Automatic annotation (TrEMBL), chain C:
Record bears the keyword Secreted: no
Alphabetically ordered keywords of this record: Capsid protein, Host nucleus, Virion
Name used for this protein in its record: Core gene UL38 family protein
Listed GO MF terms: DNA binding
TrEMBL record, chain E:
A molecular function GO annotation: structural molecule activity
HAMAP family on file: HSV_TRX2 (MF_04019)
One Pfam family per UniProt: Herpes_V23
Highest taxon above the source species: Viruses
UniProt KW keywords: Capsid protein, Host nucleus, Virion
Protein name: Similar to Saimirine herpesvirus ORF 26 protein
CC per GO annotation: viral capsid
Naturally occurring in which organism (per UniProt): Human herpesvirus 8 (HHV-8)
UniProtKB/TrEMBL annotation, chain F:
Name of the protein in question: Similar to Saimirine herpesvirus ORF 26 protein
A Pfam family hit: Herpes_V23
GO MF annotations, alphabetized: structural molecule activity
InterPro entries: Herpes_capsid_2
Keywords tagged on the record: Capsid protein, Host nucleus, Virion
Gene Ontology cellular component annotations, sorted alphabetically: viral capsid
Amino acid sequence: MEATLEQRPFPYLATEANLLTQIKESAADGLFKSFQLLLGKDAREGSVRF
Amino acid sequence: FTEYAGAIKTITSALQFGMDALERGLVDTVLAVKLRHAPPVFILKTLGD
Amino acid sequence: TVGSLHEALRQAPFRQPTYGDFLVYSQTFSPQEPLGTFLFSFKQEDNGSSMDMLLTPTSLFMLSGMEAAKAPQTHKVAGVWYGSGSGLADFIPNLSELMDTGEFHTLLTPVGPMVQSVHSTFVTKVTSAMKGVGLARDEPRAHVGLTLPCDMLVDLDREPAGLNVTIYASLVYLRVNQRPSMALTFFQSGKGFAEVVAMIKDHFTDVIRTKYIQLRHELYINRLVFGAVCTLGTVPFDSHPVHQSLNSLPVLVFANFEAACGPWTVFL
Amino acid sequence: VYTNVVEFVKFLETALAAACVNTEFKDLRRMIDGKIQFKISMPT
Amino acid sequence: ALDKSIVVNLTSRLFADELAALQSKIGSVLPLGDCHRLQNIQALGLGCVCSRETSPDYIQIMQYLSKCTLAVLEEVRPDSLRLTRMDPSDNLQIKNVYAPFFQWDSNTQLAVLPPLFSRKDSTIVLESNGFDIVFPMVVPQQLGHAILQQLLVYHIYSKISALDLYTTNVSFMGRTYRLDVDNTDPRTALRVLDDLSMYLCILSALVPRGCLRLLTALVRHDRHPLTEVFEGVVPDEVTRIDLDQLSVPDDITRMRVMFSYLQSLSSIFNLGPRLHVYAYSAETLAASCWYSPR
Amino acid sequence: ALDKSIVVNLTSRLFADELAALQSKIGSVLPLGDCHRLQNIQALGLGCVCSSPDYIQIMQYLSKCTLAVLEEVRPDSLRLTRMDPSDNLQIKNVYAPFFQWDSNTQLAVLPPLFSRKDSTIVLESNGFDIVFPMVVPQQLGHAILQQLLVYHIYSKISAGAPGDVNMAELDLYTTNVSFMGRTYRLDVDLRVLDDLSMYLCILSALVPRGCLRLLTALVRHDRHPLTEVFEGVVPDEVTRIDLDQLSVPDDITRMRVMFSYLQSLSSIFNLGPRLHVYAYSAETLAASCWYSPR
């Protein structure tokens, strides 16, 4: 079983160091796998279901 | 005064007959479940033994 | 509950329909017109710039000249309101030539149903609606629906329907008694525009054969335009037409008819 | 003015409810499925 | 404002194999029968007329589609499909999922067409209920008409035949695409060709003579780009009409009448309801169109 | 409720002569590239595609646009107002040349085709030229084109063979437009209609071959009965076209070309950025309407 991505509203933690530099390039050419874009009208916590 | 009272006694009462429509709908949908799992007598009796 | 629904209905007022003030010669518009009659407009010249011309489907029966064979019932009504049609036909001197070259359907602009018309001796005030649901102008607000006679309306009918059924207006030029004379019918279907043009051709199967054979000794290029379909507005589906007889005359009346307009499109 | 008022009904005060176990669930629109896994042992 | 959705009762249940297709095609467009809330599966399938046991009717499917409402999927539960509908003037958000991939942009002009590139691809089956949900597809109008152009050419050159690369393939700029036309029911498509034949021969009797003379002075003197449909050889039939003299006031009474019949070819080249797009994204594949029927 | 205001911020100020021209045009209908409320001057007007123009590359720009209305010209920044579908407005008849809109009529939006002194406004301070569209009543807009389309053909006939075109015949019935009990002079010496004169003429010879190839294929026991009548309207010379002189893989190239002009010429007159005026006054040039796209 390959571990996948999921959009479930985790209680995320904040790190002191930043992440945001060179991310916009890295979506076009894959620096890292398991990514999914979200635009601002739909970038939120999804409704939890089970 | 007799017109503002002649409107809110219709809007609340229409919700009373909307709230009535669910308790009538509870008894309908339980009996809709009980009949879709209801085999008749002539089938079940020989299977039941 | 009561309190949550106490606010969720306050925040929705619906838009008001438009109103086009019309101003008619009183001999071209009868006093006994049913409130909810569909209208038209005819604006040929521009030199007067004072008074306006309106045409009902009843009054257009006098100008058209289609006989009582294809339309018996309004023929009793169009005559009892207009004796010789002289109050109507004297304004338009080209009632035999506009039917020749086919320019009458380009001049009509459909408007919609009536709202409020104060009858007067010389100049009759007429208020109609163009957009929106037909409502009254003044304080006694009565929902005026559009009314069509059973003589002019021709219906088109598992039929899966959307949120829409429309009313059309065909206007077909022909020649009876070897003189030109148009013909007007009304349609009602929500079948989309790609079907009704294929259905109106089957409504005029025995008419196209009885013109071009009648006009084969001489045929003119300006005769080749044959009809024009407009789009008058939408009826909400599941709303039914109501039969109604008026002094008699059987008239269908629709409810909740919101009105629109459309360009005249040629079909043949 | 003379009006009628219809007789109101309760589900739990009808004798139908001997054939149902009744647990009120607050947010059922948040549910996808539910399941009961029986495990029947068998003697020989 | 206006609070809308559509939940659809699957009558028994559905499997886990056939759920893999209904989950993969989320955010797509399908029509449904009547604008209810609560609903059975036997209205959402476009293939209540696109059956397996009989041959389909590609015009009649498209002719069915301007009637019905259109709906967008948003969620899938294994006993209930939850959708959302499309009001006749409503700014919504559509997502580009559809497998023959055609790139969009801002201010394009979409169209909803029957599945013609592959039948088996756009028809998934649900044999837990004995029914197949059939998807339509959205296509920009540069191929919204250019498939209906190619489809009307095919039914002309089937009766004459009863070659196979010119009568079937559809040419978007850059590529070609094979249609899925093998067993059709053309008895309602030949009525459409019997509705071109009336408008076309009328447009062959009032051809304006001035425009005929400009072809005599262009296909042999200069070299226009799109005169290369012809060769240098002019048709012999054009000179057999050219011989009558010119008439300027009778190239107005022929131009005006010819102009009126080209309002009438918006009655046989109709699409379904249209989607005016006003904002599009390229790396999210999410548009935001404006629905307006007719 | 909803808000709409399209503020156009300028780089440099406007001069005195530059401002007083737009003070008179305080109410008009202008195209616009997008609907977000902060744009530059390079997004309004038809000069995005028009500033050797064509007709069709502007007519396929108006129906795919979002039109806006001037309300105020303050000397540092323009201001517009977006126009929803089915939205009441207030339009001031300001367009040059003058046409005398009649009340209760239908108004269409057409690209300009006359000389450039009347249409554009040259702004020196920012280096951009705005281009207004030509708002004509819809009957005259279908009439002002169908004569200049005739006139542009005779401008090409008389350039190669002069004896076939008479200047006494040509500039007498192609410079007067009899509409609404009046006439109107038109200022014509063209370059805008240099494709419709070719699209209608490359279609002009494909129709007589077309309406016999389409009728030899459609003959059977179940012909639609109306084409028994419309079989006779075609002239006798068109009924003798022997299609042996063109091959079958050449005839397909003469159909996919043929049908594609029959649509794309018919569509550009059934494109509807149009608005229905319901009230008007003559000596004030005030008018109200509502908009309905396509």
